[PDB]
PDB file of C-alpha atoms in Angstrom:
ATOM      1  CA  UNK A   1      -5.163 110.202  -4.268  1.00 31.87           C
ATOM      2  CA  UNK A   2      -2.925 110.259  -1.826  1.00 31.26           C
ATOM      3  CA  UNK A   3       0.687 109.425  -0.686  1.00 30.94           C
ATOM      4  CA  UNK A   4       1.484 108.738   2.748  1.00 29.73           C
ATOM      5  CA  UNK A   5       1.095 105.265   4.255  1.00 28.77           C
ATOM      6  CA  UNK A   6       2.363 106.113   7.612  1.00 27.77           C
ATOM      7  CA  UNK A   7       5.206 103.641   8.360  1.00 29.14           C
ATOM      8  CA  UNK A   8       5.846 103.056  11.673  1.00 27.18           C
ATOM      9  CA  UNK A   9       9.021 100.608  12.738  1.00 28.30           C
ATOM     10  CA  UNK A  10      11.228 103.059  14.733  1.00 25.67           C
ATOM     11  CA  UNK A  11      13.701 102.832  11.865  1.00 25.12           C
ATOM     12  CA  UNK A  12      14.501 106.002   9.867  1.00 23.91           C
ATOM     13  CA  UNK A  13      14.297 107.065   5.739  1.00 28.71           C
ATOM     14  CA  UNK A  14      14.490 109.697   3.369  1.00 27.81           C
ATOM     15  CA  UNK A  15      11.883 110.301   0.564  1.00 22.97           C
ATOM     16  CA  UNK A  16      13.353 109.211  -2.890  1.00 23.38           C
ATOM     17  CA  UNK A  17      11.026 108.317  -6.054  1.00 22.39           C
ATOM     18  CA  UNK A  18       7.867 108.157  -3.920  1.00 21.72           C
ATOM     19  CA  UNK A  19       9.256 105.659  -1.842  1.00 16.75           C
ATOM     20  CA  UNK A  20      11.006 105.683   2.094  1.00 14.13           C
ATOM     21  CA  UNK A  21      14.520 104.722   1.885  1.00 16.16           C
ATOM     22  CA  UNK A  22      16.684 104.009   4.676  1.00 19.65           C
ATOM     23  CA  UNK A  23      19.359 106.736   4.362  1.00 21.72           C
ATOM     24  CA  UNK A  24      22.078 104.607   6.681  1.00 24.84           C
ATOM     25  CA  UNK A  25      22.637 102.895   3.008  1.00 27.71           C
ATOM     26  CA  UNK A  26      23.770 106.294   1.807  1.00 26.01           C
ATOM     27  CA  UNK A  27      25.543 106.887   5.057  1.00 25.28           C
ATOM     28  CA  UNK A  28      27.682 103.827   4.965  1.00 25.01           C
ATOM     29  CA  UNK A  29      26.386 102.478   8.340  1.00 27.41           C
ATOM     30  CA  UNK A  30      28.859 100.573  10.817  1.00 27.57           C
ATOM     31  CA  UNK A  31      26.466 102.459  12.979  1.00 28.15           C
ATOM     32  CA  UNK A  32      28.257 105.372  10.998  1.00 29.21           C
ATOM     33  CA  UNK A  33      30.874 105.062  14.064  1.00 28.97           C
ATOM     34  CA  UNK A  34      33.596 104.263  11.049  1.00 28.42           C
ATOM     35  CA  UNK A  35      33.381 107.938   9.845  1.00 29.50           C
ATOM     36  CA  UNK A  36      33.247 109.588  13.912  1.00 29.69           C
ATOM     37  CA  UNK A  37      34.056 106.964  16.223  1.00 27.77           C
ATOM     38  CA  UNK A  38      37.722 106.199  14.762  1.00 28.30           C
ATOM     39  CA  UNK A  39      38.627 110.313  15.046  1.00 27.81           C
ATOM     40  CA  UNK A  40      37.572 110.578  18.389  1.00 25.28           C
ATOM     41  CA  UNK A  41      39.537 107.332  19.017  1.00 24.95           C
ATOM     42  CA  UNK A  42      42.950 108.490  17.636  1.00 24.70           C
ATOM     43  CA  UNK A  43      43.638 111.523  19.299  1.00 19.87           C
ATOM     44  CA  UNK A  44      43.330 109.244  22.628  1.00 21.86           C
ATOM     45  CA  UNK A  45      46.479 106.723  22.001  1.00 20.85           C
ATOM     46  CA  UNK A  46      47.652 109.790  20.082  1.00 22.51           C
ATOM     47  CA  UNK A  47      47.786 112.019  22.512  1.00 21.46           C
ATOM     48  CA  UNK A  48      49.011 109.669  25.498  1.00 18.40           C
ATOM     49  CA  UNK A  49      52.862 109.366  23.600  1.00 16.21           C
ATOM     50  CA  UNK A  50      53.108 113.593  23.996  1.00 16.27           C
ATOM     51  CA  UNK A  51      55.234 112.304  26.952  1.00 12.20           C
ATOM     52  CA  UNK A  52      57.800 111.712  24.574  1.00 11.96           C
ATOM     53  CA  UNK A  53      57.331 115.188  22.689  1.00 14.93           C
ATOM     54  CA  UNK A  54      58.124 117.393  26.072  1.00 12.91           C
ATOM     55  CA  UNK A  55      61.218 114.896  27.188  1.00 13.69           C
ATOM     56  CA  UNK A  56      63.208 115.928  24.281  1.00 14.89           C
ATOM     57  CA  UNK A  57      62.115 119.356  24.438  1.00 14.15           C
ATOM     58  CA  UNK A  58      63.083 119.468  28.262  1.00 16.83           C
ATOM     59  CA  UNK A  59      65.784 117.361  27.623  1.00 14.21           C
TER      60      UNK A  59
ATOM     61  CA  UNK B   1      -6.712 111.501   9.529  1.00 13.13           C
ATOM     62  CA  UNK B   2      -4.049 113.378   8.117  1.00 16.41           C
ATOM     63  CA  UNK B   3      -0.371 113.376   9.853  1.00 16.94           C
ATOM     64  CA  UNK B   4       1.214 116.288   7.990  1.00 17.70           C
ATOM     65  CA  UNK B   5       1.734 119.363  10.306  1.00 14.77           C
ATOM     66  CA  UNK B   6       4.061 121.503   8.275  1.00 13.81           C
ATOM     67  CA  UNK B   7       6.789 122.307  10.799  1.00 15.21           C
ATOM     68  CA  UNK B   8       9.047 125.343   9.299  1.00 14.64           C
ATOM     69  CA  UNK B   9      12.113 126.741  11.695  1.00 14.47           C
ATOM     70  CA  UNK B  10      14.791 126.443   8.977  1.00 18.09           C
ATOM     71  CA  UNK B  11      15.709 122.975  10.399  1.00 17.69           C
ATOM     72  CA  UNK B  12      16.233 119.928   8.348  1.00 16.04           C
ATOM     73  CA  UNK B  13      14.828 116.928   9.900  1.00 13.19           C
ATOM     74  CA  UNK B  14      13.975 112.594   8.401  1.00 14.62           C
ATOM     75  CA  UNK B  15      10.841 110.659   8.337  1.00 17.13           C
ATOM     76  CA  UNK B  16      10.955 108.702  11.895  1.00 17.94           C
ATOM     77  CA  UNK B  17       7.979 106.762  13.749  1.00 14.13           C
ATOM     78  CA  UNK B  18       6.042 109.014  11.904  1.00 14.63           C
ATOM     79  CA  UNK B  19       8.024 112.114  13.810  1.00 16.22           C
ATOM     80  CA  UNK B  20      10.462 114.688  12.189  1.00 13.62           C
ATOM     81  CA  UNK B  21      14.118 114.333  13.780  1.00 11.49           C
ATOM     82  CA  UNK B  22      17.122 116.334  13.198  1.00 12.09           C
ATOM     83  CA  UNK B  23      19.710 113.988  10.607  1.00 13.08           C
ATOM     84  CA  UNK B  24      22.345 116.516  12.630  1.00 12.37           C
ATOM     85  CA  UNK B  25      22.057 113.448  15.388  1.00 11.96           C
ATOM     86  CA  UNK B  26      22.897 110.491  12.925  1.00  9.38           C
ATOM     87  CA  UNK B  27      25.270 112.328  10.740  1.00  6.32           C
ATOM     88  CA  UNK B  28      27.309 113.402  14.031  1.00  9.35           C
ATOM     89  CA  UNK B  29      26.944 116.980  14.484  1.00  9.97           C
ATOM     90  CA  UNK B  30      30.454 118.944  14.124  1.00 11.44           C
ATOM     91  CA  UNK B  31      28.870 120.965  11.359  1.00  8.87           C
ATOM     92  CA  UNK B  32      29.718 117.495  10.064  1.00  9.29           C
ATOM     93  CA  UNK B  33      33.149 119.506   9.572  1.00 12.01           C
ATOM     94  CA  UNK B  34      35.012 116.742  11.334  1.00 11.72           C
ATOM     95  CA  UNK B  35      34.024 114.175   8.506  1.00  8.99           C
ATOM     96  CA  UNK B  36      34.747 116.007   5.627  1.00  6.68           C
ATOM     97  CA  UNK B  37      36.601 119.689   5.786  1.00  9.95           C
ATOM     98  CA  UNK B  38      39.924 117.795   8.078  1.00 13.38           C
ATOM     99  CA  UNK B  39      40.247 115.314   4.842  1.00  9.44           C
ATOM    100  CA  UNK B  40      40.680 118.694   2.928  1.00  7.08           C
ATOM    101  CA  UNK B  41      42.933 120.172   5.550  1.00  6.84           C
ATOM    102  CA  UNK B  42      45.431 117.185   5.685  1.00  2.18           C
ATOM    103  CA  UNK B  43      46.913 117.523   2.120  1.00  2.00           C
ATOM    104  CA  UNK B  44      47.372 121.105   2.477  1.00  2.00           C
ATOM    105  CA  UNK B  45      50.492 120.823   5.056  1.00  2.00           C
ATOM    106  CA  UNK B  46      51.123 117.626   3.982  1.00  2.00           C
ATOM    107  CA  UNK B  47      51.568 118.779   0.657  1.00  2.00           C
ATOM    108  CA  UNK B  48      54.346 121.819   1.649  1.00  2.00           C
ATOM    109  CA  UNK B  49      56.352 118.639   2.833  1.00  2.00           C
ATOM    110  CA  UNK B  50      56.908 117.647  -0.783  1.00  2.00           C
ATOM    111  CA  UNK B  51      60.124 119.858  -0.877  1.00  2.00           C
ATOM    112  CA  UNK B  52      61.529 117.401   1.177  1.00  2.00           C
ATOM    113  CA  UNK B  53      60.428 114.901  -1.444  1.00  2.00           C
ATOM    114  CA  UNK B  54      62.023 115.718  -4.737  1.00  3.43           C
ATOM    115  CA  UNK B  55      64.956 116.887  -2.524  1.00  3.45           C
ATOM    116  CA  UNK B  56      66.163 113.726  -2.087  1.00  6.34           C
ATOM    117  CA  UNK B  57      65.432 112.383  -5.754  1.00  6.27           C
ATOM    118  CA  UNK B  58      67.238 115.949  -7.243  1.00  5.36           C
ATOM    119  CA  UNK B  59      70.387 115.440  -4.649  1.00  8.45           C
TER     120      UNK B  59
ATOM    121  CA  UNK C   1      -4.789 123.102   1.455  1.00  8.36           C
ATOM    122  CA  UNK C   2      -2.421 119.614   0.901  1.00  5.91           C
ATOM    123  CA  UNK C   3       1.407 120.147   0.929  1.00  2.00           C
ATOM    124  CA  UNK C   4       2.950 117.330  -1.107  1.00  3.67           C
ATOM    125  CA  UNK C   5       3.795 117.541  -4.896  1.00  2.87           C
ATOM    126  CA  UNK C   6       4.931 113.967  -5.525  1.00  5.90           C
ATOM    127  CA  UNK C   7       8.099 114.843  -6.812  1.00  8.97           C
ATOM    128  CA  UNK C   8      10.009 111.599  -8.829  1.00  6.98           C
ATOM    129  CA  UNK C   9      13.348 111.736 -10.498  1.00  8.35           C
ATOM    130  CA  UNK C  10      15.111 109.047  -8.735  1.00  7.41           C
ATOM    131  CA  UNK C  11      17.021 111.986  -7.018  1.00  3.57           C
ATOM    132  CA  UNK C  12      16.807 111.761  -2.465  1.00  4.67           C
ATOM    133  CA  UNK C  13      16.158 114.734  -0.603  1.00  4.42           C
ATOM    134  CA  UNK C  14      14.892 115.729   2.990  1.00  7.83           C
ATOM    135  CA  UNK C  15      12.142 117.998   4.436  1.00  6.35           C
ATOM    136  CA  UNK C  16      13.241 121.077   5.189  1.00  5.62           C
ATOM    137  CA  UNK C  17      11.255 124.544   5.900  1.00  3.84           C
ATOM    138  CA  UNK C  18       8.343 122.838   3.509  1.00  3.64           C
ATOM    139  CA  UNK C  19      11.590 121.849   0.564  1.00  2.22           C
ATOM    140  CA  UNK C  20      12.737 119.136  -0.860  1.00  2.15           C
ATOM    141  CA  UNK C  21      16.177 119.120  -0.547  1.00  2.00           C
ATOM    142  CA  UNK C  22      18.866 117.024  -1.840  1.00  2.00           C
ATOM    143  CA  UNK C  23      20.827 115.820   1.703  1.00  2.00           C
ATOM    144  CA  UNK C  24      23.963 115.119  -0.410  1.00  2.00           C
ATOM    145  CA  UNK C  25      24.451 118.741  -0.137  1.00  2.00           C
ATOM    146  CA  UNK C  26      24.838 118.409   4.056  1.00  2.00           C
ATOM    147  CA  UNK C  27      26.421 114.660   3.216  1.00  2.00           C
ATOM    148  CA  UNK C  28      29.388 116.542   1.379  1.00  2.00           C
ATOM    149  CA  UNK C  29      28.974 114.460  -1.880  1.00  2.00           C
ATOM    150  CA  UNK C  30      32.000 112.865  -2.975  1.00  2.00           C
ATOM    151  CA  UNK C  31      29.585 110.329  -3.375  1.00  2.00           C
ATOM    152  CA  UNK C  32      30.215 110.097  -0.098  1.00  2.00           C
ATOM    153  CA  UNK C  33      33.210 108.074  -1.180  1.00  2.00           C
ATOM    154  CA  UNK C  34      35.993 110.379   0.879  1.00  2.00           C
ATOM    155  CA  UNK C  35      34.406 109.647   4.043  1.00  2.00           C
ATOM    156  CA  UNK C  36      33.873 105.696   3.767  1.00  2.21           C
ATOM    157  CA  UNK C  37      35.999 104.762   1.055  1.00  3.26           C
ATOM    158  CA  UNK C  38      39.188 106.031   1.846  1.00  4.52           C
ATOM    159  CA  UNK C  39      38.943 104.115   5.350  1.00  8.24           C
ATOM    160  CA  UNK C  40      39.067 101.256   3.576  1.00 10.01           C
ATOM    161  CA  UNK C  41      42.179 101.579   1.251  1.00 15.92           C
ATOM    162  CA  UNK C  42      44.369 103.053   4.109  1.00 17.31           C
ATOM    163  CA  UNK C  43      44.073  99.314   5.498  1.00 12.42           C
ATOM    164  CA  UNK C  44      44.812  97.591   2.296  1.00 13.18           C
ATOM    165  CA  UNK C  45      48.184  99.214   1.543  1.00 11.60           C
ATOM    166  CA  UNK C  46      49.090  99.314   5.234  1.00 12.90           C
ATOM    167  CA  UNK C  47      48.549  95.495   5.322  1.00 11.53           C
ATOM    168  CA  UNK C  48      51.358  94.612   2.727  1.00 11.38           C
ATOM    169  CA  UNK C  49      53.800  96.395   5.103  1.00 11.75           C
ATOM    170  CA  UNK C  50      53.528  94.112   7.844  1.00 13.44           C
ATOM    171  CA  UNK C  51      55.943  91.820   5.907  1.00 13.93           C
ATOM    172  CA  UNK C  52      58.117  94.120   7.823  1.00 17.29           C
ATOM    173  CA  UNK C  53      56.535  94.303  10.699  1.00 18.30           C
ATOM    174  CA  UNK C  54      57.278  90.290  11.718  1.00 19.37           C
ATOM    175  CA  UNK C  55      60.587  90.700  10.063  1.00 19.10           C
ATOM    176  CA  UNK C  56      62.106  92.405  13.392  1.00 16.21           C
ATOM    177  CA  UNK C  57      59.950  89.959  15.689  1.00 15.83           C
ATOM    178  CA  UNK C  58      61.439  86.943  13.919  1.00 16.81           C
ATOM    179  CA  UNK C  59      64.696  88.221  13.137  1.00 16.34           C
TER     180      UNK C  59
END
């Protein structure tokens, strides 16, 4: 008669087909730090070789 | 005896411990822009750089 | 008086404003594929280039 089960395990799903579905599988996990974590991560080394982009410019 | 409290602000929100949370949080915020729409972006001036390309090739 | 439909067509969505929605939509579809998957070949054909990158170190 009715649905909900209430699942509690402090993990987090989405509702597909009547059932709850981890959505990190349709994420792509790696903690989903592979799709944010690597572009916050590239403008650091990135950005520490601008030394070299002024010296010619001054010089 | 029921759990459901119909929450409605416009907000999208998952299943968690039996609480509604904002995806926003796992997905990484950014609009979510910053996965997706700088993909897009890159080809666009990377793309004007193919006169270069052919340039070599033709001469 | 009850909320839920019990809506199956193998399709995942979210809870928003009392909707199901589909969260590929906020995702960016692509299957997803051109946030994960391209991370993955940029390695591959960057790999085979080290051949070049010992070449110096050795020689």
């Amino acid at each position: 008669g009715y649905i909900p089960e209430a699942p509690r395990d402090g993990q987090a799903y989405v509702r597909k087909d009547g059932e709850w579905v981890l959505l990190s599988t349709f994420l792509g996990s790696s903690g989903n730090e592979q799709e944010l974590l690597e572009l916050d991560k590239w403008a650091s080394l990135w950005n520490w070789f601008n030394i070299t982009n002024w010296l010619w410019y001054i010089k």
